[PDB]
């Protein structure tokens, strides 16, 4: 019940023979916010595609929810119901319809009692802060609102894991902290595990319990962000108290 994903000695090579991930060991705790950090080309998408089964490891394995992944068609279908994906650009995920039609599209085809669809969708919209936009056309929303609609559409299925692909995209730093604090809050109320792929090492990690730094398809650092970015954190606190001394420490 500690780890929602354990990656054990995982290797991945593309079918052309390109070695993408090497001896990856990663233990992701249930009900924490974990981020996987690194610039492009580091292998974040390759890792995340293994998590939801679109790729299968060449060597080693992944335990999801304490159990091996079942790679049959049925097993993959089951695994993806447990795992919600929020895309970088919400346009890639949203329908042109009202916020309520889009978000409720998911429940509507699972044959639930209507009043259970009602609760699920309304709770989803409250939980993402977008009740007031229930009847607004998606095409009229800000990027930030759209992203909240994407998240809400995924909450409706009650996944166990929420995976966000670069959640800082299209957002100013205060935009970023808004979305991060929203995610920290929904975990408090839902117990959902949050996994983030990002290159942002400044804001995103202040909201994380755990962090993995990747380079050329290997983990090279890991742990509590307070400890991993111990030095950046000292600087941050200095700016907070003595604005000018902290810039001589960046000098």
DSSP states of 143-172 as a string? HHHHHHHHHHHHHTT--SEEEEE-TTTT--
Taking CA atoms, 119 is separated from 28, 123, 131, 161, 181, in Å, by 30, 6, 12, 21, 23
In contact, 226 and 65? CB cutoff 8 Å: no
Nearest to 222 by CA among 64, 41, 35: 35
In contact, 163 and 85? CB cutoff 8 Å: yes
b/e code 111-141 from CB counts within 10 Å (16+ = b):
eeeeeebeebbeebbebbbbeebeeeebeeb
Q: Which domains does the chain have, with CATH numbers?
A: 1-251 (3.40.50.300)
The binding site consists of 38-45
User: Which residues are paired to 67 by β-bridges?
Assistant: 64
What is the experimental resolution, given in Å to one decimal place? 2.3
Give the determination technique. X-ray
Kindly give the pairing relationship between strand 218-223 and strand 59-64: unpaired
CB atoms under 10 Å from CB of 241, counted, come to 8
Reported as type and span, the H/E element at residue 85 is strand 83-86
The binding site for ATP consists of 38-45
């Amino acid at each position: 019940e500690d780890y929602i994903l354990k990656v054990e000695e995982l290797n991945y090579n593309y079918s052309d023979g390109t070695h993408a991930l090497k001896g990856i060991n990663m233990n992701i705790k249930r009900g924490e916010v974990t981020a996987i950090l690194g610039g492009n080309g580091v292998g974040k998408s390759t890792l995340f595609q293994n998590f939801n089964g679109i790729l299968k490891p060449s060597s080693g394995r992944i335990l999801f929810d304490n159990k091996p992944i079942d790679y049959s068609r049925k097993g993959i279908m089951k695994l993806r119901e447990s795992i919600g994906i929020v895309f970088q650009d919400p346009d890639n995920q949203l329908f042109s319809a009202s916020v309520y039609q889009d978000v409720s599209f998911g429940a509507v085809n699972m044959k639930l009692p209507e009043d259970e669809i009602r609760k699920r969708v309304d709770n989803a919209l409250k939980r993402t802060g977008i009740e007031h936009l229930k009847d607004k056309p998606t095409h009229c929303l800000s990027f930030g609102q759209k992203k909240r609609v994407a998240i809400a559409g995924v909450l409706v299925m009650e996944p166990k894991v929420l995976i966000l692909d670069e959640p800082t995209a299209g957002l100013d730093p205060m935009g970023v902290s808004e979305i991060m604090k929203l995610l920290v809050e929904m975990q408090k109320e839902l117990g959902i595990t949050i996994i983030i792929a990002t290159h942002d090492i400044d804001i995103v990690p202040l909201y994380c319990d755990n962090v993995f730094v990747m380079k050329e398809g290997r983990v090279i650092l890991q742990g509590n962000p307070k400890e991993v970015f111990a030095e950046k954190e000292v600087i941050r606190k200095v700016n907070l108290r003595l604005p000018r001394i902290g810039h001589l420490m960046e000098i």
